[PDB]
């Protein structure tokens, strides 16, 4: 039993809700919140900009030190950093950005990072400003993630389409 509330159950391990991931994280304080990161951990917009804003830019400060030490992530890769005031940990995961021409096949590799954590609060990878089809992202999530994932979908209209079209 965990404290996530109001989710629709899609499969044995995947749950979904129309919610603002920032507000969900502030309420639940999950062990892991997933950020929709880019390889430079520049948290300018989309989910990343919103999460970073909620940390009063502490996420960006920590991320800049991470990059200065380690260099950029790989597309499809991840790193674990602090969750600041939102969660114990933040798993920064880089899905492919279609608006940069990146290979959508890398979306499966991106979701594989979730399997290193027993329970996660997450957005749909590569959705939103990353330009992928969210219906496809949900399909890849369900077919790749085996650990318990709670998906927050900001847009109510999109949430309804994801549920109604879910096979
Ligand atoms: C700011 C923000 C963004 C861009 N997205 C991704 C997204 C948005 C619209 C359609 C699809 C995906 C979020 N997802 C969850 N919570 C959030 N606060 C956000
Ligand atoms: Cl985004």
UniProtKB/Swiss-Prot annotation:
Localized where?
Answer: Host endoplasmic reticulum membrane
Q: Which residues of the full protein are shown?
A: 1025 to 1191 of 7096
Q: Which reaction does it catalyse?
A: Thiol-dependent hydrolysis of ester, thioester, amide, peptide and isopeptide bonds formed by the C-terminal Gly of ubiquitin (a 76-residue protein attached to proteins as an intracellular targeting signal)
- All copies of the Macro domain together span 1-167
The task this protein performs is described as: Responsible for the cleavages located at the N-terminus of the replicase polyprotein. Participates together with nsp4 in the assembly of virally-induced cytoplasmic double-membrane vesicles necessary for viral replication. Antagonizes innate immune induction of type I interferon by blocking the phosphorylation, dimerization and subsequent nuclear translocation of host IRF3. Also prevents host NF-kappa-B signaling. In addition, PL-PRO possesses a deubiquitinating/deISGylating activity and processes both 'Lys-48'- and 'Lys-63'-linked polyubiquitin chains from cellular substrates.
Superkingdom as given in the UniProt entry: Viruses
Report activity regulation: Inhibited in vitro by GRL-0617.
Membrane topology type: Multi-pass membrane protein
Q: Which organism is it from?
A: Severe acute respiratory syndrome coronavirus 2
**Oligomer and partners:** May form homohexamers. Interacts with N protein.
Q: What is the name of this protein?
A: Papain-like protease nsp3
Q: What is the lineage of its organism?
A: Viruses, Riboviria, Orthornavirae, Pisuviricota, Pisoniviricetes
């Amino acid at each position: 039993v965990n404290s996530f509330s109001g989710y629709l159950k899609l499969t044995d391990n995947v749950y979904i809700k129309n919610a603002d991931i920032v507000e969900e994280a502030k309420k639940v304080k999950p062990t892991v919140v997933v950020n929709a990161a880019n390889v430079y951990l520049k948290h300018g917009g989309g989910v990343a900009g919103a999460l970073n804003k909620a940390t009063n830019n502490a996420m960006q400060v920590e991320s800049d030190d991470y990059i200065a030490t380690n260099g950029p992530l790989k597309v499809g890769g991840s790193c674990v950093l602090s969750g600041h005031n939102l969660a114990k940990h933040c798993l920064h995961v880089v899905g492919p950005n279609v608006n940069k021409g990146e290979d959508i096949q890398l979306l499966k590799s991106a979701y594989e990072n979730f399997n290193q954590h027993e329970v996660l609060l997450a957005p749909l990878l590569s959705a939103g400003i990353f330009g992928a089809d969210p219906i496809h992202s949900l399909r890849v999530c369900v077919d790749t993630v085996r650990t318990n994932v709670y998906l927050a979908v900001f847009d109510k209209n999109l949430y309804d389409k994801l549920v109604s079209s879910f096979l």
